[PDB]
Structure 1
Amino acid sequence: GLIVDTRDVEERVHVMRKTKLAPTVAHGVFNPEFGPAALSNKDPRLNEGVVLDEVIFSKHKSDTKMSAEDKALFRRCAADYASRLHSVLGTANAPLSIYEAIKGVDGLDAMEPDTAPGLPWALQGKRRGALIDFENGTVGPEVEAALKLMEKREYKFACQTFLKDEIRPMEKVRAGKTRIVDVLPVEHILYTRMMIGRFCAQMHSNNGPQIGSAVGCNPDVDWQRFGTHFAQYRNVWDVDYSAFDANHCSDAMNIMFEEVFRTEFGFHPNAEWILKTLVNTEHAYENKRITVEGGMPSGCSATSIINTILNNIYVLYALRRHYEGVELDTYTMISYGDDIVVASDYDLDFEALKPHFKSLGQTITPADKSDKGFVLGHSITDVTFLKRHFHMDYGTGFYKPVMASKTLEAILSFARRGTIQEKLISVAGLAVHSGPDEYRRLFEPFQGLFEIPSYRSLYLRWVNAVCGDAAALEHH
């Protein structure tokens, strides 16, 4: 986005500056080029001259203004994708009740009771539990009044900037490229879930190539579905964006919201309004208040879905800006936020599409840095999606999600205090697809200290998960 105003008010919004992450026994074995992100300006690991609060917002450098012709084309592409989207999902997009928005419906998880409430509740020392009853699904007097202001469309708010305590590559830790979470007020999150939660649940349930969304997928079971689909096409592209979320221009955001969330598709009129409030935002970091135009906040409800929808429209837009006669059936794609795999039987020049993505303020590069550009003839077994490769399991003939060993090693090298055992069981479900030799090697440092699931038990679990009949047929 674009930083348009910076103010210094005499009210501190104090941020966390101490990491919950600590090295594990595996850290001394794998020695990863990774570490916890810098949360303080006085972190000794930082380069001698890095100003963390400047590097945090450095992603906001532009809000690209699209021409009249480009805006018209974008609207056309947004309407065409929305047509496809709502044809598959249906038009049952009525507002969620206050109860259902908190408790969650089929395909939508419940709201977290003990997470950050946002502003101005954080300054008043209030939590989410004090403002909202998460057991009975009811709201207090404060949230009640705020919801009525949103209905009148007169509600205004500020985003609370939070440092993301996570493992990052050492080069980015040293540079101070700490990621940020834009924590929105809890009532804004609730009302967004009221406005588009039904839609959001449907997209999770109907995830796949047909809607171009993998949001709500289970890579264990869905890699077979995704893998066999993309295997049918002549060309497959692994496309990377740089600062996707930040580089969404106001024009693209506004037009998308206008075309996708129309009342004629079953939405409440305020669905479009509440999403449009994410375009021009105020951010609170300590004493400074930063006004940003364009870009997507990360703490907003349905950021993954919004980013995914934009990704789908971007591809159609760029192809239509370059080629004549492009439709939704010209290609196929799957997206999860900024992450994307594209495929076609046509030999599409993705290198030529670069300036067309630039007209949206987006920068595309091939994932693999072997070639000096995009090349044809790649298959599904060459690309990465959700940090996972597409590998064939020789035992079953099904596609399996394989994460790189260096990634798994980095994951296993750090943990939040008192969570190591629970973490190991989770990572074991990821590591099983690397094979018995690699699985054993990854969990060797933990042996005798924690319970590690056998490779066998997790393999048999996976076979039944992907195909129940195949597991039963093995007992022929």
Structure 2
Amino acid sequence: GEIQWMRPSKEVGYPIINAPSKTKLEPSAFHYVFEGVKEPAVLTKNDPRLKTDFEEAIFSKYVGNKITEVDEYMKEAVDHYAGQLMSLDINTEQMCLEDAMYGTDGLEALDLSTSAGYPYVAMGKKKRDILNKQTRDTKEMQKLLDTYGINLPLVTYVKDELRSKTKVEQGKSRLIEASSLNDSVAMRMAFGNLYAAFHKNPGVITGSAVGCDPDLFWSKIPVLMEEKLFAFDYTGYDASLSPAWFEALKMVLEKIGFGDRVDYIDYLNHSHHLYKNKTYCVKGGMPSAISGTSIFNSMINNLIIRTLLLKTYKGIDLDHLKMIAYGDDVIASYPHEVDASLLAQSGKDYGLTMTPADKSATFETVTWENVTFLKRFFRADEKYPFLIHPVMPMKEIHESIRWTKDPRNTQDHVRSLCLLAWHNGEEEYNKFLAKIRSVPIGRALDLPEYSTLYDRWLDSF
């Protein structure tokens, strides 16, 4: 991805977009009961903690576009992946407006708490004013589609979340690039059934984990993986994607019966954004918050890994490449050992910056003991080995519990963390609960005990 130009929005007929500047994150009642070093991300140019220009830092993710056309290895990757998706008999018909707005089997209703995007954010009109969960009314939406059309600018917001000390100082805040409600609706109508098929089929056929339930999915992954695992991290995946990867994605869509609306992908590839009082044009780079972001990043990841394998290992049998992606995150396997370092080398030529799995210093062999997916390790249950625990290290949970965005959601927030933590074992879980209960706020929470969560887990399969 590369920003073509940036200029005052007024110069191109757009209003100034008001974006938050004060974090809603504040120390929680557990701030001093648990250790952590993360703080709220810099949200404004004048944040005192900044040690470098903010604007420059947030847009530096756009490292450029390394490739223009779809080469022969990519075309082969496209054919193999598309052929694989064909086996799912994905319903290629457009999804009706109602289901696209309020959901259906395999697709949850539009989130009413997220931005409505342009021009609604500028007209002070909320989603709640347009959608009605109880009525499933499409009349108001339909008039808006007719009035403002599609392919509207994407509104950019700095994401309010916790970040490392370094990322705070370097102004490395992440951005929310929200599509207009009109575009979310149009894209969900165009690809609604594709989204549903993926959500209902997490695994090695879709090559996607989007919509998965880790508590149940983890026991299914090993049987899907090959004999040899391999993985690696991407540096700024979304923003590094070159236009050619979007074209390759369109080829897949065409081959599986959606050639009908590949135009929507152009809207993702060549897009314009509004940030504060500026407007800018980007070539390449996947927008962080459009409907289908994680699904398309996942599809593209399937194309990337297949491409690098073909380019690096001629004669590779893609029918034995078993991988599952969640955006840029991936867990992959092959009957034979492969060199991630070589794949990373080949990756640079395609505009991808690949590094050792989980921040490792060197490319090491990935095993069932050290592999992670969605930050979770895999650990067989002690009593029933066939049941696999998704294990997120307590470090992440501790970092998260030390802050709150709304005192009213304290119990939901803490319970959510408990659902993640108990997998670390009864001893650790109890220590976690004891610390929570070392302060008044924690003592007033209704939290599940270990045996309750274990029983509930067994009863969920």
Q: Flag whether TM exceeds 0.5 (same fold).
A: yes
Task: Tell me how far 1:30 sits from its aligned partner.
Answer: 2.0
Deviation at residue 330 of structure 1 after TM alignment: 3.4
Residues matched between the structures, number: 450
1:128 Cα deviation from its structure 2 partner = 1.6
Instruction: Quote how far apart the aligned CAs of 1:71 are.
Output: 2.2
Match of 2:449? 454
Partners of 2:206 and 2:165 lie apart in 1 by 37
Q: Which amino acid aligns with 1:333?
A: M
One-letter amino acid of the structure 1 residue matched with residue 331 of structure 2 = V
TM-score, with normalisation over the residues of structure 2?
A: 0.92
Query: Is 1:343 the counterpart of 2:342 in the alignment?
Result: no
Could you tell me which amino acid in structure 1 is paired with residue 114 of structure 2?
T
Equivalent residues of 1:282, 1:289 under 8 A apart = yes
Q: What CA distance in whole angstroms lies between the structure 2 residues aligned with 1:31 and 1:102? A: 42
Contact 1:238 1:384 in 2 (8 A): no
Matched, 1:414 2:403: yes
Partner of 1:21: 25
Corresponding residue for residue 379 of structure 1: 367
Q: Name the CA shift for 1:202/1:61 in 2 (closer, same or farther; >3 Å).
A: same
Q: 1:114 to 1:135 in 2, by over 3 A?
A: farther
SS in 1 for 2:268: coil
Q: What SS class does the counterpart of residue 82 from structure 1 fall into?
A: helix
- Note if contact 2:322-2:334 (Cα within 8 Å) is conserved in structure 1: yes
Shift in Å, 1:143: 4.5
Q: Unmatched 5+ residue regions in structure 2?
A: 438-442
Identity %: 31
Distance 2:431 2:138 in 1: 50
Query: Do the aligned partners of residues 29 and 91 (structure 1) sit closer, same or farther apart at CA in structure 2, a change above 3 Å counting?
Result: closer
- Answer whether contact 1:75 1:256 (CA < 8 A) is retained: no
Distance 2:164 2:82 in 1: 37
Contact 1:66 / 1:360 at 8 angstroms: preserved in 2?
A: no
Deviates more, 1:322-331 or 1:217-226: 322-331
Show the counterpart of 2:60. Answer: 58
Q: Distance in 2 between matches of 1:201 and 1:330?
A: 25
Go from structure 1 to structure 2 and tell me whether the alpha carbon gap of 1:124 and 1:370 turns closer, same or farther (over 3 Å shift).
Answer: closer
Letter in 1 for 2:161: E
Other-structure match for 1:429: 419
1:9–1:221: structure 2 CA closer, same or farther, 3 Å change rule? closer
Q: CA shift at 1:132, angstroms?
A: 4.0
| Distance (whole Å) between structure 2 residues aligned to residue 252 and residue 140 of structure 1 | 37
Distance change in 2, residues 1:319/1:148 (3 Å):
farther
Structure 2 contact 90–197 (Cα < 8 Å) conserved: no
User: 1:340: how far off?
Assistant: 0.7
Conservation of the 8 A alpha-carbon contact between 1:59 and 1:246: yes
**C-alpha separation between the residues in 2 aligned to 1:359 and 1:97?**
41
The structural deviation recorded for 1:82 is 1.1
Is there any run of 5+ residues in structure 1 with no aligned partner, and where? 467-476
Q: 2 CA distance for matches of 1:282 and 1:454?
A: 49
Aligned partner of residue 93 in structure 1, secondary structure: coil
Query: SS at the partner of 2:324?
Result: strand
Are the aligned partners of 1:316 and 1:327 in contact in 2 as well (CA < 8 Å)?
A: no
Mapping 1:128-167, distance limit 5 Å: 128-140=127-139, 143-144=142-143, 146=145, 155-167=150-162
Instruction: Establish whether residue 301 from structure 1 lines up as the match of residue 291 from structure 2.
Output: yes
**2:62 is aligned with what amino acid?**
H
CA distance in 2, matches of 1:255, 1:249: 10
Answer whether contact 1:281 1:292 (CA < 8 A) is retained: yes
| Cα displacement string for residues 341-378 of structure 1 (whole angstroms, at most 9, x for unaligned residues) | 12122121221122321122001111255553x234x3
Return 70-79 or 191-200, whichever deviates more. Answer: 70-79
Aligned mates of 1:191, 1:148 — CA distance in 2: 14
**Whole-Å Cα distance in 2 between the matches of residues 405 and 139 of structure 1?**
44
Equivalent residue of 1:216, what SS?
Answer: coil
Secondary structure, aligned partner of 1:246: helix
In 1: Cα distance, 2:358 partner to 2:98 partner: 46
Task: Check whether the contact 1:250–1:279 (CA below 8 A) recurs between aligned residues.
Answer: yes
Q: TM-score, normalised by structure 1?
A: 0.90
Tell me: CA distance 1:142–1:383, structure 2 relative to 1, closer, same or farther (3 Å).
Answer: closer
Q: Summarize deviations over 1:168-191 as a string: whole Å, max 9, x none.
A: 222212221111100111010001
Which residue number corresponds to residue 94 of structure 2?
A: 95
1:289 aligned to 279, 284, 289, which one? 279
Partner of 1:469: none
Change (3 A) 1:179 1:101: same
1:386 CA drift (Å): 0.4
Output the amino acid matched with 1:310. I
Give the drift of 1:43.
2.2
Residue in 2 that maps onto 1:260? 252
Assess if the C-alpha contact under 8 Å between 2:155 and 2:178 holds in 1. Answer: yes
Paired position in structure 1 for 2:123? 124
In the alignment, is the contact (CA less than 8 A) between 1:46 and 1:175 conserved in 2? Answer: yes
Letter in 2 for 1:382: N
